[PDB]
Design a protein around this ligand. Structure first.
Ligand SMILES: Cc1cc2nc3c(=O)[nH]c(=O)nc-3n(C[C@H](O)[C@H](O)[C@H](O)COP(=O)(O)OP(=O)(O)OC[C@H]3O[C@@H](n4cnc5c(N)ncnc54)[C@H](O)[C@@H]3O)c2cc1C
Ligand SMILES: Cc1ncc(C(=O)O)c(CO)c1O
Length: 370
């Protein structure tokens, strides 16, 4: 009598899906292919939409404790401040990835979500079957493909996919704030530090709390010094000398990686009893800082549509129809911003840019008007 769900992927999308379903009385098992539950990418921004998902998941308190809302989101071009934005009170937050992940994992475990590590999904059947790498076949009423950009769940079924890969990437790190050492300034702000001269180098400066600073060091792949890991300290200090104390700390991180990005748009997100959520369905450009935000909204919204008394297959179709346009629009605008380097101008968090952020998944309305 109890509905059973199998979720592939222990990232933000899968954990959100698992918690939301479990709260609604589903028996839920989650599979993570890695040997342990961990989140990579150093730091992350969430906004009102994702904070509302966290509220709905009962995971908000653990997130807000030990995370940070800057006094303002500031943009520089060539060390000149070009904008300071506060989004008319719209809630937002910066945190380490591990901080968000821990909150979600703790909540999943408190609810009794069955979590299997070293467990890899390699195929899904729309009739409600999930196959693991070992050969084990699991039957369920709902299968969730939350297994990231290279989703085997998705690819085992076959979806029409618009794929794009970025030639350029960035190096994302957590370092000590070194706040005292930074001297005079507004070092609690988000500061997006753009430059095109003398070279294309950018740092997104993102405090996570009183102890930890999230840095995104961005340079073209064709730049053999700026794209180097561990970081080429000299070329970063040269263009960002006011961050030297933090950059010296960053240079100690020998695990640093230069990560490129892909985007994904699919003809649909569903097939029978299989739903694709998160990057598996809709990986996007990071300009609007909404990749995980949309992923969490979508995973949460999936649980909502499964409460309507419909068959799982109909609920999944209804879910995509209801919730997908917010993501399609956000993904498109982020792509345009990225292609045009729009954020470099500052003042670009317009009402349209903030549309995904303004969405409240709990009440299903748009809040915090701009
Ligand atoms: C540079 C950059 C910056 C970003 N900044 C932000 C930001 O500030 N704010 C924001 O909201 N979003 C941001 N995003 C986007 C965000 O990182 C993603 O949208 C989000 O992490 C997607 O989560 P997911 O759970 O869908 O996928 P993933 O995070 O990829 O997680 C899937 C989980 O999949 C597990 N797995 C993979 N294959 C299998 C398998 N076969 N079987 C079982 N498990 C499997 C993976 O190991 C992992 O544990 C950023 C993205 C990039 C690239
Ligand atoms: C929060 C954020 N905003 C914008 C961008 C961007 O691509 O301009 C990135 C990439 O790291 C971000 O992480």
């Amino acid at each position: 009598k109890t509905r059973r769900a199998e979720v592939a992927g222990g990232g933000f999308a899968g954990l959100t899906a698992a918690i939301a379903l479990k709260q609604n009385g589903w028996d839920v098992r989650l599979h993570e292919k890695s040997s342990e539950l961990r989140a990579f990418g150093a730091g992350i921004y969430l906004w009102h939409n994702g904070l509302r998902v966290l509220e709905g998941l009962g995971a908000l308190d653990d997130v807000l404790q030990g995370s940070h809302t800057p006094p303002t989101y500031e943009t520089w071009m060539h060390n000149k401040s070009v904008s300071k934005e506060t989004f008319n009170g719209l809630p937002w937050r910066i945190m380490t990835r591990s901080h968000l992940h821990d909150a979600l994992v703790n909540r999943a475990r408190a609810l009794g979500v069955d979590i299997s590590v070293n467990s890899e999904a390699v195929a899904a059947d729309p009739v409600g079957r999930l196959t693991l790498q070992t050969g084990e076949v699991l039957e369920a009423d709902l299968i969730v493909g939350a297994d990231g950009v290279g989703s085997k769940v998705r690819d085992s079924i076959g979806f029409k996919q618009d794929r794009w890969v970025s030639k350029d990437g960035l190096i994302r790190l957590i370092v000590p704030r070194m706040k005292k050492e930074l001297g005079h300034g507004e070092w609690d702000n988000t500061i997006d530090m753009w430059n095109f001269w003398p070279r294309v180098q950018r740092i997104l400066y993102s405090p996570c709390n009183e102890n930890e600073l999230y840095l995104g060091l961005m340079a073209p792949a064709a730049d053999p010094r700026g794209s180097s890991v561990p970081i080429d300290l000299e070329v970063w200090v040269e263009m960002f000398p006011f961050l030297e104390p933090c950059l010296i700390e960053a240079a100690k991180l020998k695990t640093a990686r230069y990560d490129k990005y892909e985007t994904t748009k699919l003809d649909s997100w569903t097939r029978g009893k299989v739903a694709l959520v998160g990057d598996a369905a809709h990986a996007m450009c990071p300009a609007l800082a909404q990749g995980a935000g949309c992923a969490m909204v979508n995973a949460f919204s999936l649980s909502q549509d499964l409460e309507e008394g419909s068959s799982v297959e109909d609920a999944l179709v209804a879910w995509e129809t209801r919730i997908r346009p917010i993501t399609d629009r956000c993904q498109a605008l982020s792509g345009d911003y990225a292609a045009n380097r729009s954020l470099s101008k500052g003042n670009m968090f317009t009402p349209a840019a903030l549309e995904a952020a303004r969405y409240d998944p709990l009440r299903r309305v748009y809040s915090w008007p701009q």
